[PDB]
mmCIF file of C-alpha atoms in Angstrom:
data_model
loop_
_atom_site.group_PDB
_atom_site.id
_atom_site.type_symbol
_atom_site.label_atom_id
_atom_site.label_comp_id
_atom_site.label_asym_id
_atom_site.label_seq_id
_atom_site.Cartn_x
_atom_site.Cartn_y
_atom_site.Cartn_z
ATOM 1 C CA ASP A 5 -64.517 52.960 -77.152
ATOM 2 C CA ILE A 6 -64.100 51.110 -73.792
ATOM 3 C CA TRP A 7 -64.873 47.572 -72.582
ATOM 4 C CA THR A 8 -65.815 46.022 -69.232
ATOM 5 C CA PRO A 9 -62.967 43.930 -67.794
ATOM 6 C CA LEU A 10 -63.254 40.192 -68.505
ATOM 7 C CA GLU A 11 -64.213 37.986 -65.579
ATOM 8 C CA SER A 12 -61.112 35.813 -64.800
ATOM 9 C CA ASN A 13 -63.024 33.088 -62.933
ATOM 10 C CA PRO A 14 -61.972 29.743 -64.605
ATOM 11 C CA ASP A 15 -65.568 28.636 -65.267
ATOM 12 C CA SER A 16 -66.515 31.940 -66.987
ATOM 13 C CA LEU A 17 -63.381 31.792 -69.147
ATOM 14 C CA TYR A 18 -64.279 28.249 -70.249
ATOM 15 C CA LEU A 19 -67.885 29.097 -71.045
ATOM 16 C CA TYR A 20 -66.734 32.210 -72.923
ATOM 17 C CA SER A 21 -64.358 30.014 -74.907
ATOM 18 C CA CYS A 22 -67.118 27.552 -75.776
ATOM 19 C CA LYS A 23 -69.139 30.351 -77.377
ATOM 20 C CA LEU A 24 -66.047 31.681 -79.173
ATOM 21 C CA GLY A 25 -65.386 28.163 -80.635
ATOM 22 C CA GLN A 26 -62.981 26.420 -78.256
ATOM 23 C CA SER A 27 -64.180 23.797 -75.738
ATOM 24 C CA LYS A 28 -61.052 21.634 -75.545
ATOM 25 C CA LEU A 29 -58.991 23.730 -73.064
ATOM 26 C CA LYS A 30 -59.831 24.472 -69.432
ATOM 27 C CA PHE A 31 -58.458 26.749 -66.705
ATOM 28 C CA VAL A 32 -57.179 25.888 -63.201
ATOM 29 C CA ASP A 33 -56.240 28.444 -60.510
ATOM 30 C CA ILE A 34 -52.587 28.825 -59.579
ATOM 31 C CA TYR A 35 -52.418 29.437 -55.797
ATOM 32 C CA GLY A 36 -48.746 30.419 -55.794
ATOM 33 C CA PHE A 37 -45.498 29.980 -57.706
ATOM 34 C CA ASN A 38 -43.431 27.906 -55.241
ATOM 35 C CA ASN A 39 -42.808 24.223 -56.168
ATOM 36 C CA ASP A 40 -45.229 22.807 -53.601
ATOM 37 C CA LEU A 41 -48.175 24.686 -55.179
ATOM 38 C CA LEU A 42 -47.147 24.268 -58.822
ATOM 39 C CA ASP A 43 -46.888 20.500 -58.196
ATOM 40 C CA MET A 44 -50.689 20.684 -57.604
ATOM 41 C CA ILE A 45 -51.386 21.711 -61.179
ATOM 42 C CA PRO A 46 -52.483 18.993 -63.592
ATOM 43 C CA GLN A 47 -50.196 18.429 -66.619
ATOM 44 C CA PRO A 48 -49.545 18.865 -69.472
ATOM 45 C CA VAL A 49 -49.861 22.629 -68.957
ATOM 46 C CA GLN A 50 -50.378 24.365 -72.285
ATOM 47 C CA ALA A 51 -50.087 27.966 -71.151
ATOM 48 C CA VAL A 52 -50.313 30.281 -68.187
ATOM 49 C CA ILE A 53 -52.578 33.300 -67.969
ATOM 50 C CA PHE A 54 -51.422 36.033 -65.553
ATOM 51 C CA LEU A 55 -53.255 39.072 -64.165
ATOM 52 C CA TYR A 56 -51.433 41.938 -62.426
ATOM 53 C CA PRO A 57 -52.071 45.646 -61.724
ATOM 54 C CA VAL A 58 -50.889 48.722 -63.748
ATOM 55 C CA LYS A 75 -33.434 36.734 -80.514
ATOM 56 C CA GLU A 76 -36.398 38.553 -82.139
ATOM 57 C CA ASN A 77 -37.882 36.798 -85.110
ATOM 58 C CA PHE A 78 -41.562 36.067 -84.455
ATOM 59 C CA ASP A 79 -42.412 34.346 -87.746
ATOM 60 C CA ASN A 80 -44.021 31.392 -85.971
ATOM 61 C CA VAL A 81 -46.022 33.246 -83.278
ATOM 62 C CA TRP A 82 -49.479 34.733 -83.717
ATOM 63 C CA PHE A 83 -49.580 38.252 -82.214
ATOM 64 C CA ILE A 84 -52.351 40.873 -81.965
ATOM 65 C CA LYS A 85 -51.991 44.506 -80.852
ATOM 66 C CA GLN A 86 -54.380 45.758 -78.185
ATOM 67 C CA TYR A 87 -56.040 49.081 -78.864
ATOM 68 C CA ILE A 88 -59.124 48.859 -76.555
ATOM 69 C CA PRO A 89 -58.899 49.397 -72.750
ATOM 70 C CA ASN A 90 -60.059 46.302 -70.810
ATOM 71 C CA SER A 91 -60.240 44.162 -73.941
ATOM 72 C CA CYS A 92 -57.091 42.408 -72.572
ATOM 73 C CA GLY A 93 -58.932 39.342 -71.307
ATOM 74 C CA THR A 94 -60.045 38.683 -74.881
ATOM 75 C CA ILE A 95 -56.681 39.559 -76.423
ATOM 76 C CA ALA A 96 -55.271 36.867 -74.058
ATOM 77 C CA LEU A 97 -57.732 34.255 -75.254
ATOM 78 C CA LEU A 98 -56.887 35.342 -78.811
ATOM 79 C CA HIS A 99 -53.136 34.967 -78.183
ATOM 80 C CA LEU A 100 -53.865 31.637 -76.506
ATOM 81 C CA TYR A 101 -56.001 29.767 -79.003
ATOM 82 C CA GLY A 102 -54.249 31.434 -81.927
ATOM 83 C CA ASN A 103 -50.913 29.830 -80.920
ATOM 84 C CA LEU A 104 -52.435 26.405 -79.987
ATOM 85 C CA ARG A 105 -54.382 26.144 -83.268
ATOM 86 C CA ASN A 106 -52.359 23.115 -84.445
ATOM 87 C CA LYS A 107 -52.857 21.196 -81.210
ATOM 88 C CA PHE A 108 -56.377 22.196 -80.193
ATOM 89 C CA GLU A 109 -58.388 23.099 -83.270
ATOM 90 C CA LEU A 110 -61.300 25.515 -83.248
ATOM 91 C CA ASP A 111 -64.874 24.610 -84.047
ATOM 92 C CA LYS A 112 -65.298 24.986 -87.805
ATOM 93 C CA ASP A 113 -67.222 28.198 -88.729
ATOM 94 C CA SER A 114 -67.172 29.553 -85.122
ATOM 95 C CA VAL A 115 -66.512 33.172 -84.200
ATOM 96 C CA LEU A 116 -62.805 32.528 -83.564
ATOM 97 C CA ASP A 117 -62.230 30.143 -86.482
ATOM 98 C CA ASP A 118 -63.700 32.855 -88.741
ATOM 99 C CA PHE A 119 -61.649 35.638 -87.113
ATOM 100 C CA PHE A 120 -58.316 33.781 -87.337
ATOM 101 C CA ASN A 121 -58.946 32.888 -90.992
ATOM 102 C CA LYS A 122 -59.907 36.474 -91.783
ATOM 103 C CA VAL A 123 -56.818 38.018 -90.159
ATOM 104 C CA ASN A 124 -54.374 35.215 -90.979
ATOM 105 C CA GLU A 125 -52.453 37.365 -93.539
ATOM 106 C CA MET A 126 -52.675 40.571 -91.445
ATOM 107 C CA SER A 127 -50.004 42.206 -89.288
ATOM 108 C CA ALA A 128 -50.426 42.470 -85.503
ATOM 109 C CA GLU A 129 -51.570 46.105 -86.092
ATOM 110 C CA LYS A 130 -54.339 45.411 -88.610
ATOM 111 C CA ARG A 131 -55.372 42.358 -86.582
ATOM 112 C CA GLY A 132 -55.910 44.687 -83.658
ATOM 113 C CA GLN A 133 -57.949 47.074 -85.809
ATOM 114 C CA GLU A 134 -60.079 44.155 -87.056
ATOM 115 C CA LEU A 135 -60.936 43.320 -83.426
ATOM 116 C CA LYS A 136 -62.458 46.804 -83.013
ATOM 117 C CA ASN A 137 -64.833 45.990 -85.887
ATOM 118 C CA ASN A 138 -65.868 42.501 -84.618
ATOM 119 C CA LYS A 139 -69.380 42.690 -83.186
ATOM 120 C CA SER A 140 -69.593 38.998 -82.264
ATOM 121 C CA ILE A 141 -66.548 39.054 -80.024
ATOM 122 C CA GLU A 142 -67.393 42.400 -78.381
ATOM 123 C CA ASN A 143 -70.908 41.067 -77.688
ATOM 124 C CA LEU A 144 -69.728 37.687 -76.397
ATOM 125 C CA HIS A 145 -67.071 39.437 -74.298
ATOM 126 C CA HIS A 146 -69.753 41.444 -72.447
ATOM 127 C CA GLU A 147 -71.691 38.251 -71.666
ATOM 128 C CA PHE A 148 -68.610 37.083 -69.673
ATOM 129 C CA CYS A 149 -67.420 40.393 -68.234
ATOM 130 C CA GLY A 150 -67.439 41.567 -64.588
ATOM 131 C CA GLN A 151 -70.341 43.440 -63.019
ATOM 132 C CA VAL A 152 -70.587 47.233 -63.192
ATOM 133 C CA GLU A 153 -72.278 49.184 -60.340
ATOM 134 C CA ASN A 154 -70.471 52.436 -61.063
ATOM 135 C CA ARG A 155 -68.150 53.963 -63.649
ATOM 136 C CA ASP A 156 -65.051 52.796 -61.705
ATOM 137 C CA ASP A 157 -65.881 49.191 -62.742
ATOM 138 C CA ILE A 158 -65.394 50.056 -66.444
ATOM 139 C CA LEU A 159 -63.154 53.160 -66.331
ATOM 140 C CA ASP A 160 -60.725 51.678 -63.794
ATOM 141 C CA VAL A 161 -58.327 49.815 -66.127
ATOM 142 C CA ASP A 162 -55.889 48.660 -63.436
ATOM 143 C CA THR A 163 -55.516 44.841 -63.804
ATOM 144 C CA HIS A 164 -54.066 43.359 -67.029
ATOM 145 C CA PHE A 165 -54.074 39.903 -68.657
ATOM 146 C CA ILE A 166 -51.009 38.464 -70.290
ATOM 147 C CA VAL A 167 -50.232 34.946 -71.471
ATOM 148 C CA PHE A 168 -47.279 32.582 -71.722
ATOM 149 C CA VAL A 169 -47.304 29.806 -74.304
ATOM 150 C CA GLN A 170 -44.705 27.244 -75.367
ATOM 151 C CA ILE A 171 -43.821 27.694 -79.058
ATOM 152 C CA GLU A 172 -41.121 25.459 -80.537
ATOM 153 C CA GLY A 173 -39.530 24.802 -77.144
ATOM 154 C CA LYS A 174 -39.501 28.517 -76.255
ATOM 155 C CA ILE A 175 -41.501 30.255 -73.516
ATOM 156 C CA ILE A 176 -43.134 33.208 -75.299
ATOM 157 C CA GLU A 177 -44.821 36.003 -73.319
ATOM 158 C CA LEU A 178 -47.739 37.580 -75.212
ATOM 159 C CA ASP A 179 -48.934 41.124 -74.269
ATOM 160 C CA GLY A 180 -50.938 43.362 -76.720
ATOM 161 C CA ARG A 181 -49.564 46.616 -75.271
ATOM 162 C CA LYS A 182 -45.988 45.726 -76.213
ATOM 163 C CA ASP A 183 -44.838 45.997 -79.825
ATOM 164 C CA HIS A 184 -43.961 42.351 -80.186
ATOM 165 C CA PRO A 185 -43.956 39.087 -78.280
ATOM 166 C CA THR A 186 -41.234 38.734 -75.632
ATOM 167 C CA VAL A 187 -39.210 35.541 -76.157
ATOM 168 C CA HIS A 188 -37.926 34.279 -72.782
ATOM 169 C CA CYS A 189 -35.999 30.974 -72.622
ATOM 170 C CA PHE A 190 -36.002 27.404 -73.887
ATOM 171 C CA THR A 191 -38.027 24.785 -72.075
ATOM 172 C CA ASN A 192 -39.997 21.575 -72.429
ATOM 173 C CA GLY A 193 -43.382 20.051 -71.582
ATOM 174 C CA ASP A 194 -42.362 18.857 -68.120
ATOM 175 C CA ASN A 195 -40.652 22.151 -67.214
ATOM 176 C CA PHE A 196 -42.917 24.768 -68.828
ATOM 177 C CA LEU A 197 -45.112 25.540 -65.761
ATOM 178 C CA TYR A 198 -42.015 25.848 -63.544
ATOM 179 C CA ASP A 199 -39.812 27.887 -65.896
ATOM 180 C CA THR A 200 -42.851 30.137 -66.381
ATOM 181 C CA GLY A 201 -43.277 30.591 -62.607
ATOM 182 C CA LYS A 202 -39.649 31.697 -62.282
ATOM 183 C CA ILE A 203 -40.142 34.224 -65.072
ATOM 184 C CA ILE A 204 -43.304 35.575 -63.371
ATOM 185 C CA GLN A 205 -41.610 35.832 -59.950
ATOM 186 C CA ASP A 206 -38.475 37.651 -61.192
ATOM 187 C CA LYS A 207 -40.104 39.812 -63.899
ATOM 188 C CA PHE A 208 -43.291 40.826 -62.011
ATOM 189 C CA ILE A 209 -43.697 39.695 -58.388
ATOM 190 C CA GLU A 210 -40.340 40.360 -56.676
ATOM 191 C CA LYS A 211 -39.664 43.259 -59.079
ATOM 192 C CA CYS A 212 -42.791 44.927 -57.626
ATOM 193 C CA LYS A 213 -42.029 47.104 -54.553
ATOM 194 C CA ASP A 214 -45.193 46.041 -52.703
ATOM 195 C CA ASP A 215 -47.652 43.187 -52.067
ATOM 196 C CA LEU A 216 -48.336 42.484 -55.791
ATOM 197 C CA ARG A 217 -51.834 40.988 -55.730
ATOM 198 C CA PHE A 218 -51.707 38.925 -58.888
ATOM 199 C CA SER A 219 -53.708 35.959 -60.069
ATOM 200 C CA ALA A 220 -52.668 33.159 -62.356
ATOM 201 C CA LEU A 221 -54.345 30.348 -64.276
ATOM 202 C CA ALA A 222 -52.806 27.206 -65.893
ATOM 203 C CA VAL A 223 -54.427 26.143 -69.180
ATOM 204 C CA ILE A 224 -54.755 22.361 -69.443
ATOM 205 C CA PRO A 225 -56.531 19.879 -71.701
ATOM 206 C CA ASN A 226 -60.194 19.391 -70.953
ATOM 207 C CA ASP A 227 -59.895 15.618 -71.503
ATOM 208 C CA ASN A 228 -57.667 12.586 -72.108
#
């Protein structure tokens, strides 16, 4: 049971979200993590999605375990809209609204198993996945999506391969994008002993 990696292009992510039941949030490329470039990002930033190669009470954070290779794009969208549900509501009776209601009382483990059995999402996923010319486009699981969201003034990193969310530090609206950049630089970029070709996206409101 293997999936085609999700296309990370901001337009494809949006369109994919629209079909899943969320049209209120959009994605904007992050060109770098220095202040100059982060200043270019429109605010308020609601989250940051990050792609790269290869206390603990989480009562208030929605978490799903990842069991399927290259489903991570979708897991990230799940972690994203699932934790912004109060602020940006899902379309009533949409694929995601239905999924979140169905798994609301489930643990991160059973949530993850439910994903396996969700035809709609798997189908919609592979309408917004990358192209495949050869097996190395689906069997090469090298790049990985993770997401950072602000939950009760705390920067929470959400990754389905880990056993739980990773709580980082306190923050606020104004500072979230910047505190997040510092975390990404020290935890992933500079910690990597090479030219870490990453990509990043800020999630912002579609309107105001």
